[PDB]
């Protein structure tokens, strides 16, 4: 890594929860056809490392993340403008392009639409609950049989946001077709109700504040818990397990739907890459094809891909129908540079409230001020 970005090869960064072995296979096909070697890496804290190394002219040729970080990368000067032809643009849904547009420029290729769904064990729970409010009662009932109702990652605000946003929580107000960076909705009554409900689930021992991705995945996949909250990428490991699972609508809170933040998995080209044409060729002609997306989706499901041709095939899968039904109830993440600060603030708020180190009201009051920074 001592020679900066090397000309005549492609280095790709993608998060470890994604289908990197699939993407590697698309890499191999590219190498066979072009002679250009493609390396797929999955470094820890990818989304934090990229801006550090990209600024010095290092790091990958291509970076994969949800669109929410890309505005920051672009504002920081780390992303090449992408120049897809109208012919190519027509192959992907316009709303996916909308997610990767910053100051009227396209700054990434959209790949797939992700939203959290309720995942339930059909053998333990033939009828999943429609409301958050009925989960304590269900937990009391399952705890008698040595089970629990619900376990999900409490360490990442992505997973708790849906409950927080349900009764009127929001990140940045979309007003007059723009995001108001002065109008943050993390310390409003809805957000407070939402987080208070979550902290109560913990106080009444229906959930544990320390529960992370691994613990929740293990618990559900061993059939110790009736329900989890997760994204398409998680289905592969549940398939391999004994569990007969359904993916369905998230529970309502105070009779309003859970509002998951919708992410578009996106591929940006490092502004310092000397391999931009090769990156464009790889993403347009190899990855964003039925065969390309199929290779990745076979490893770990992408959700609802941006490519119309392949989306029409996958749309018939009720898991993806449920993904899109959840997506339609939530709102697409902003890509504005402030999202990084917002996420850091909400992360701290939820951990501090869940651990009991701070009150919900104080935790969220602090987050609100910190988000505008
Ligand atoms: O939790 C804050 C985190 O939320 C999102 O990250 C998700 C990501 O979108 C999913 O595709 C998957 O990788 O899991 C992540 C949750 O750990 C935001 O995109 C990210 O910026 C933010 O830090
Ligand atoms: Cu080196």
Author numbering: -2 to 370
The paper states:
Here, the high-affinity copper(II)-binding tripeptide GHK was fused to the N-terminus of a GFP variant and an MBP-FG peptide fusion. The GHK tag promoted crystallization, with various residues (His, Asp, His/Pro) from symmetry molecules completing the copper(II) square-pyramidal coordination sphere. Rapid structure determination by copper SAD phasing could be achieved, even at a very low Bijvoet ratio or after significant radiation damage. We further show that an N-terminally fused GHK peptide can be utilized in standard crystallographic methods to enhance the crystallization of proteins and to provide reliable phasing sites for structure solution with minimal effort.
To test our predictions that single-site GHK-Cu phasing could be universally applicable, we cloned, expressed and crystallized a complex between maltose-binding protein and a 29-residue FG-containing peptide from the amino-terminal region of Tetrahymena thermophila MacNup98a. The non-GHK-tagged protein had previously undergone screening using 14 commercial screens and failed to produce any hits; however, the GHK-tagged protein produced six hits in these commercial crystallization screens, with condition 1-29 from the Morpheus screen producing the best crystals. From this crystal form, we collected 3 × 360° (1080°) of data at different positions within the same crystal. The data were collected at 1.3776 Å (9.0 keV) with an anomalous scattering of 3.88 e for Cu. The theoretical Bijvoet ratio for GHK-MBP-Nup98 (12 × 43.3 kDa) at this wavelength was 1.41%. The diffraction extended to 2.7 Å resolution and, although the anomalous signal was much weaker than for the GHK-GFP cases, automatic structure solution was again possible using CRANK2. The final structure contained 12 molecules per asymmetric unit. All copper sites refined with an occupancy of 1.0 but with an unusual copper(II) coordination. The equatorial plane ligand and the apical water molecule are replaced by residues His39-Pro40 from a symmetry molecule. Unfortunately, the C-terminal FG-containing peptide is highly disordered in the crystal structure and we were unable to visualize the interactions between FG motifs.
